[PDB]
């Protein structure tokens, strides 16, 4: 499915208008109708970002499907999807507990293999029970079939 568009499609009218407008105001010095790290650098400090010049080039090269440093009306709205949510917000001992009660398909306090297979599908491709079969085995601190908030803590802290 979509990755960035899904995060921008939720933006607020005040965001698209300010973004779509800023670009049309910062591209005035552009040449192909876009703003690369050289032109998008003035749009970030004006909006609400304090990225550096060394990381900037890396930010685009990572989200850019061609790794060039340029960003148009699309690459732009995509530069806020990675700087707002997804791989950025906090994530430590709390992110592990929430993910458990948020993926418990059986919703019974624990999770079995049939449930873990769905949790990875929400964040992984289509694997077979063969690969997800060893994940639940080593993820079980006591090898019982169900995984609670305690055993799950280790299963995610390290396994392969």
Can you say how many angstroms the Cα of residue 103 is from the centroid of all Cα atoms in its chain? 17
CB of 130 to Ca ion, least distance (A): 21
Does the annotation place 151 within a ligand binding site?
Answer: yes
Please say which residue, 39 or 64, places its beta carbon nearer to Ca ion: 64
The residue range among 6-14, 18-26, 81-89, 145-153 that interacts with Ca ion, by the rule CB under 5 A, is 145-153
Give the length of the chain. 160
For the chain, how far is it from start to end, CA to CA, in angstroms? 28
Among 95, 114, 133, 144, binds Ca ion (CB under 5 A): 144
Does the annotation place 92 within a ligand binding site?
Answer: no
Does the annotation place 101 within a ligand binding site?
Answer: no
Both structure tokens of 4? 């960035």
Both structure tokens of 37? 């790290």
Q: By CB under 5 A, tell whether 61 contacts Ca ion.
A: no
Q: What angle do CA 86, 92, 98 make, to 5 degrees?
A: 75
Q: Which residues bind Ca ion (CB under 5 A)?
A: 64, 68, 70, 104, 106, 108, 111, 140, 144, 147, 151
């Amino acid at each position: 499915a979509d990755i960035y568009k899904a995060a921008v499609e939720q933006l607020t009218e005040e965001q698209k208008n300010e973004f779509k407008a800023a670009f049309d105001i910062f591209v005035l010095g552009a040449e192909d109708g876009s703003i690369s790290t050289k032109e998008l650098g003035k749009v970030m400090r004006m909006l609400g970002q304090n990225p550096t010049p060394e990381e900037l080039q890396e930010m685009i090269d990572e989200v850019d499907e061609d790794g060039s440093g340029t960003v148009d009306f699309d690459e732009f709205l995509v530069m806020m999807v990675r700087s707002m949510k997804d791989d950025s917000k906090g994530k430590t001992e709390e992110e592990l507990s929430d993910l458990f009660r948020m993926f418990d398909k059986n919703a019974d306090g624990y999770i079995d293999l049939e449930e873990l297979k769905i949790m990875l599908q929400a964040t992984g491709e289509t694997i077979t029970e063969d690969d997800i079969e060893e994940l639940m085995k080593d993820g079980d601190k006591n090898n019982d079939g169900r995984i609670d908030y305690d055993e799950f803590l280790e299963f995610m802290k390290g396994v392969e």
